[PDB]
C-alpha cells in the first residue's frame, strides 16, 4: 500500500511508518485494497465469503469456519500477521517492516507519536509525523483525527 | 495533558448551568469529549459525547432533551450544558478526552485523560449559615475512662462547612461525619472527639465551625454534664 | 443498555497480598471488528477516574505491572499482584462495545484488619436546640470493623421509620475502622410526648444486638 493506492470500497489512513486500507462501512479487507460484504454466519450458503479482514468463510462430519489467509493468525479475534502474534506496541499497531526480507512485525504509531529508542521501539516517543496522503478531491485535505491521518472535507 | 473543567456551580431547580473544559497538551481538535457524572456516594454515568474533529454529538436518553454540548475549536474548549435542572442532577461532572471519529475505530481508545471534575448542585434552598449545638458528654458518652463529645452542625446550605477542634490542636479521636442532605434541602453534619474522661475537668473543648458561603463562624465550647 | 456488574462491592485487601476484581457484563463485548473495547478505572479518593487498562488487557502507560487484566465474551478481571496502600479507592469497568458506553458500579478497595465492635454512644438534644423547636437525637457507632452495621431507633419501644439518617467516615488511616452517626429528628412537641430513647445496633463484632438509651429529661 502506497500514496498511490486507491482503497476499493474503502479510505487510506496513514500513521508514523505506514499506510493501509480503511473500510467502509462494516465490509472487511479481502487483501491490502480491497473491502467487500462480510457474512454474519459462516456455512454453506456463505462459503468462500470473507467473514472478516483477511479471513473468508471455508469447509473442513462436513462443518464450515471462519479462517485467515494464509501469513495470517487469529489472535483475539482478529486476523494479524504471523510475525505480529507476539509483539505489542502501545500507542500503534504491529505491521511487518518493509525494509526487513525477513518478515519481522515491528510498531507503527499514532500520529504524534513514533518508536522510541529508549522503550524497544514502542510507541512511546511523542514525534511528528508529515502527512503523505495524496486527497484528490478538491474539496478534501488530509486530516488527523484519533492518532491517523486520513483525507476528509477542509 | 490535561482538561481542566470550570469552578463549582449552584443552581436553583428549573435553571441551566454551563461546565466547560479546556484541552492541553494534545490536538484537541484531532478527538472528541465524552462527559460522565457522578452523583454523591454513587458510580460513573455517561451523558453524551461531541467531536471536536467534526462536531457529531451523541446525547444519553437520560438527558438527550435538554443537554446542549458544544466545541469552541479557538480556546480548545468543550462546553456542556444541561438545562431545567432537577435536584437529581446534583453531581460532579467529569469531561474526558474521547474519540473525534464517532464512525471508524482505527487504534485509539478513549477516556485515557479526565478533567478534575465539577461540582453541580441543584437545590431550591438559599445559603445559609448553620446551627451549631452540644453533644454533651455524659454517662451515656462514657465508656471505660474514655468519654465521647461532639458538635451537630445543622441546616446549612450549601457544602462544604468545616470543623475544628480547639482550634486545630485536638486531632486524635476526631471524626467529621459525612453530611446528610435533609427533607428540608439543608444539610447537617455532626462532629465528634473521644478523650480521656479525666480530662473533662482539666481541659476545654471548643469545635470550630466555619461556613464560607455564608461567611459563618462559630465556636461551641461544649461542656460536660456530671 | 449493556449492564455491567461488578463483584465484590466491597474488597479488603492486605498489603503485599494479590486482589482480584470481577466485571461481568449482559452481553457480548466482542465487535464487529473483532475488538473487545472493556477498560479498568481507578479512583482516588477525592480524585478523577484514571484509566489504568484499555482494550481488556492494555495496561496505560505510567500504570504499575502489578495491574493486569484479562477476560473476553462478558466475564473479566482486574488483578493487583501486590496492594500497595495507594491502590485503596474504587475500581470501575466500562465498555464502549455498544452504544451508550455503560460502567459498572464499581468496587471499592478498602484495608483488611479484623474484626472490632463499636463502642455505642447516645446524645440526647441539647437544651439550645430544643428552645428553637426541633430534637435531634444522635447515635454515635465508634472504631468499628467491618464497615456494614444495621441501627434502629425505638422510641417507647416503637419502631422509626423514615425520621433517621447516617453517614459514615471513610477508613481510617491508622487503624483502619469506620464510625457511623445515626440522627433522629423529631419536632419538639413529638418529642417531649415520649419517654424512652434508643438506638439498637447491630455489628459482626457483637453477638447480641447492643441497645443504648436514655429517658427525656434524666
Given at each position: 500500500v502506497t500514496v498511490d493506492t486507491v482503497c476499493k470500497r474503502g479510505f487510506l489512513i496513514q500513521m508514523s511508518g505506514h499506510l493501509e486500507c480503511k473500510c467502509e462501512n462494516d465490509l472487511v479487507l479481502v487483501n491490502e485494497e480491497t473491502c467487500e460484504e462480510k457474512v454474519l454466519k459462516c456455512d454453506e450458503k456463505t462459503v468462500?465469503?470473507?467473514?472478516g479482514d483477511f479471513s473468508k468463510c471455508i469447509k473442513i462430519p462436513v462443518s464450515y469456519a471462519c479462517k485467515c489467509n494464509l501469513g495470517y493468525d487469529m489472535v483475539n479475534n482478529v486476523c494479524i500477521p504471523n510475525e505480529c502474534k507476539q509483539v505489542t506496541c502501545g500507542n500503534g499497531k504491529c505491521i511487518l517492516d518493509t525494509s526487513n526480507p525477513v518478515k519481522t512485525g515491528v510498531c507503527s504509531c499514532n500520529i504524534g507519536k513514533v518508536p522510541n529508542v529508549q522503550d524497544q521501539n514502542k510507541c512511546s516517543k511523542d514525534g511528528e509525523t508529515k502527512c503523505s496522503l495524496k486527497?484528490?478531491?478538491?474539496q478534501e485535505t488530509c486530516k488527523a483525527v484519533d492518532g491517523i491521518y486520513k483525507c476528509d472535507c477542509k | 495533558v490535561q482538561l481542566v473543567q470550570s469552578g463549582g456551580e449552584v443552581k436553583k431547580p428549573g435553571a441551566s448551568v454551563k461546565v466547560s473544559c479546556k484541552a492541553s497538551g494534545y490536538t484537541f481538535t484531532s478527538y472528541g469529549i465524552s462527559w460522565v457524572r457522578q452523583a454523591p456516594g454513587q458510580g460513573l454515568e455517561w451523558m453524551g459525547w461531541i467531536s471536536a474533529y467534526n462536531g457529531n454529538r451523541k446525547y444519553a436518553q437520560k438527558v438527550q432533551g435538554r443537554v446542549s454540548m458544544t466545541i469552541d475549536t479557538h480556546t480548545s474548549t468543550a462546553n456542556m450544558e444541561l438545562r431545567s435542572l432537577r435536584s437529581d442532577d446534583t453531581a460532579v461532572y467529569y469531561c474526558a478526552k474521547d474519540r473525534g471519529d464517532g464512525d471508524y475505530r482505527y487504534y485509539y481508545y478513549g477516556m485515557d485523560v479526565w478533567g478534575q471534575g465539577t461540582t453541580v448542585t441543584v437545590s431550591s434552598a438559599s445559603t445559609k449559615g448553620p446551627s451549631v449545638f452540644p453533644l454533651a458528654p455524659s454517662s451515656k458518652s462514657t465508656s471505660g475512662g474514655t468519654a465521647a463529645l461532639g458538635c451537630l452542625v445543622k441546616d446549612y446550605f450549601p457544602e462544604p462547612v468545616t470543623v475544628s477542634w480547639n482550634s486545630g490542636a485536638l486531632t486524635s479521636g476526631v471524626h467529621t461525619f459525612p453530611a446528610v442532605l435533609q427533607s428540608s434541602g439543608l444539610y447537617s453534619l455532626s462532629s465528634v472527639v473521644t478523650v480521656p474522661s479525666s480530662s473533662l475537668g482539666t481541659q476545654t473543648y471548643i469545635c470550630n465551625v466555619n461556613h464560607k458561603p455564608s461567611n459563618t463562624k462559630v465556636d461551641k465550647k461544649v461542656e460536660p454534664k456530671s | 443498555d449493556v449492564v455491567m456488574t461488578q463483584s465484590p462491592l466491597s474488597l479488603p485487601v492486605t498489603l503485599g497480598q494479590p486482589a482480584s476484581i470481577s466485571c461481568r457484563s449482559s452481553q457480548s463485548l466482542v465487535y464487529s471488528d473483532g475488538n473487545t473495547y472493556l477498560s479498568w478505572f481507578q479512583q482516588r479518593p477525592g480524585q478523577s477516574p484514571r484509566r489504568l487498562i484499555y482494550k481488556v488487557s492494555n495496561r496505560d502507560s505510567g500504570?504499575?505491572?502489578r495491574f493486569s487484566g484479562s477476560g473476553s465474551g462478558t466475564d473479566f478481571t482486574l488483578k493487583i499482584s501486590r496492594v500497595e496502600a495507594e491502590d485503596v479507592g474504587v475500581y470501575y469497568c466500562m465498555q464502549?462495545?455498544?452504544?451508550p458506553p455503560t460502567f459498572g458500579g464499581g468496587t471499592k478497595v478498602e484495608i483488611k484488619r479484623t474484626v472490632a465492635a463499636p463502642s455505642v454512644f447516645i446524645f440526647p438534644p441539647s437544651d439550645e436546640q430544643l428552645k428553637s423547636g426541633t430534637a435531634s437525637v444522635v447515635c454515635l457507632l465508634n472504631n468499628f470493623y467491618p464497615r456494614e452495621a444495621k441501627v434502629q431507633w425505638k422510641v417507647d419501644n416503637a419502631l422509626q421509620s423514615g425520621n433517621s439518617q447516617e453517614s459514615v467516615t471513610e477508613q481510617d488511616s491508622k487503624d483502619s475502622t469506620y464510625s457511623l452517626s445515626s440522627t433522629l429528628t423529631l419536632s419538639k412537641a413529638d418529642y417531649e410526648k415520649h419517654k424512652v430513647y434508643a438506638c439498637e445496633v447491630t455489628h459482626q463484632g457483637l453477638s447480641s444486638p447492643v441497645t443504648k438509651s436514655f429517658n427525656r429529661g434524666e
Amino acid at each position: 500500500v502506497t500514496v498511490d493506492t486507491v482503497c476499493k470500497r474503502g479510505f487510506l489512513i496513514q500513521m508514523s511508518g505506514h499506510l493501509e486500507c480503511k473500510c467502509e462501512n462494516d465490509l472487511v479487507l479481502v487483501n491490502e485494497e480491497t473491502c467487500e460484504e462480510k457474512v454474519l454466519k459462516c456455512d454453506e450458503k456463505t462459503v468462500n465469503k470473507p467473514c472478516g479482514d483477511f479471513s473468508k468463510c471455508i469447509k473442513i462430519p462436513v462443518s464450515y469456519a471462519c479462517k485467515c489467509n494464509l501469513g495470517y493468525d487469529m489472535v483475539n479475534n482478529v486476523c494479524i500477521p504471523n510475525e505480529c502474534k507476539q509483539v505489542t506496541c502501545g500507542n500503534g499497531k504491529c505491521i511487518l517492516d518493509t525494509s526487513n526480507p525477513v518478515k519481522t512485525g515491528v510498531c507503527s504509531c499514532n500520529i504524534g507519536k513514533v518508536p522510541n529508542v529508549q522503550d524497544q521501539n514502542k510507541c512511546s516517543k511523542d514525534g511528528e509525523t508529515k502527512c503523505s496522503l495524496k486527497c484528490l478531491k478538491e474539496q478534501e485535505t488530509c486530516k488527523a483525527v484519533d492518532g491517523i491521518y486520513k483525507c476528509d472535507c477542509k | 495533558v490535561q482538561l481542566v473543567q470550570s469552578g463549582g456551580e449552584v443552581k436553583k431547580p428549573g435553571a441551566s448551568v454551563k461546565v466547560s473544559c479546556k484541552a492541553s497538551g494534545y490536538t484537541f481538535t484531532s478527538y472528541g469529549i465524552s462527559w460522565v457524572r457522578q452523583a454523591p456516594g454513587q458510580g460513573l454515568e455517561w451523558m453524551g459525547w461531541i467531536s471536536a474533529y467534526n462536531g457529531n454529538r451523541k446525547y444519553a436518553q437520560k438527558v438527550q432533551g435538554r443537554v446542549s454540548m458544544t466545541i469552541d475549536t479557538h480556546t480548545s474548549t468543550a462546553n456542556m450544558e444541561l438545562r431545567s435542572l432537577r435536584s437529581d442532577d446534583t453531581a460532579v461532572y467529569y469531561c474526558a478526552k474521547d474519540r473525534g471519529d464517532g464512525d471508524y475505530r482505527y487504534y485509539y481508545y478513549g477516556m485515557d485523560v479526565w478533567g478534575q471534575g465539577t461540582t453541580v448542585t441543584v437545590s431550591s434552598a438559599s445559603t445559609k449559615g448553620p446551627s451549631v449545638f452540644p453533644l454533651a458528654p455524659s454517662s451515656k458518652s462514657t465508656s471505660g475512662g474514655t468519654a465521647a463529645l461532639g458538635c451537630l452542625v445543622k441546616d446549612y446550605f450549601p457544602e462544604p462547612v468545616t470543623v475544628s477542634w480547639n482550634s486545630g490542636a485536638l486531632t486524635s479521636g476526631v471524626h467529621t461525619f459525612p453530611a446528610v442532605l435533609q427533607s428540608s434541602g439543608l444539610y447537617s453534619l455532626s462532629s465528634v472527639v473521644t478523650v480521656p474522661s479525666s480530662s473533662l475537668g482539666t481541659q476545654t473543648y471548643i469545635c470550630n465551625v466555619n461556613h464560607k458561603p455564608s461567611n459563618t463562624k462559630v465556636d461551641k465550647k461544649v461542656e460536660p454534664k456530671s | 443498555d449493556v449492564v455491567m456488574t461488578q463483584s465484590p462491592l466491597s474488597l479488603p485487601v492486605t498489603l503485599g497480598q494479590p486482589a482480584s476484581i470481577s466485571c461481568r457484563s449482559s452481553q457480548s463485548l466482542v465487535y464487529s471488528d473483532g475488538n473487545t473495547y472493556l477498560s479498568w478505572f481507578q479512583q482516588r479518593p477525592g480524585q478523577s477516574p484514571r484509566r489504568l487498562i484499555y482494550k481488556v488487557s492494555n495496561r496505560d502507560s505510567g500504570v504499575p505491572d502489578r495491574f493486569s487484566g484479562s477476560g473476553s465474551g462478558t466475564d473479566f478481571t482486574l488483578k493487583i499482584s501486590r496492594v500497595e496502600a495507594e491502590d485503596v479507592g474504587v475500581y470501575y469497568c466500562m465498555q464502549d462495545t455498544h452504544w451508550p458506553p455503560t460502567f459498572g458500579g464499581g468496587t471499592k478497595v478498602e484495608i483488611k484488619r479484623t474484626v472490632a465492635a463499636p463502642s455505642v454512644f447516645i446524645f440526647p438534644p441539647s437544651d439550645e436546640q430544643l428552645k428553637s423547636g426541633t430534637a435531634s437525637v444522635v447515635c454515635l457507632l465508634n472504631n468499628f470493623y467491618p464497615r456494614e452495621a444495621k441501627v434502629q431507633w425505638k422510641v417507647d419501644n416503637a419502631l422509626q421509620s423514615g425520621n433517621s439518617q447516617e453517614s459514615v467516615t471513610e477508613q481510617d488511616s491508622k487503624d483502619s475502622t469506620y464510625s457511623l452517626s445515626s440522627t433522629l429528628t423529631l419536632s419538639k412537641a413529638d418529642y417531649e410526648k415520649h419517654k424512652v430513647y434508643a438506638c439498637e445496633v447491630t455489628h459482626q463484632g457483637l453477638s447480641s444486638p447492643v441497645t443504648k438509651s436514655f429517658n427525656r429529661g434524666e
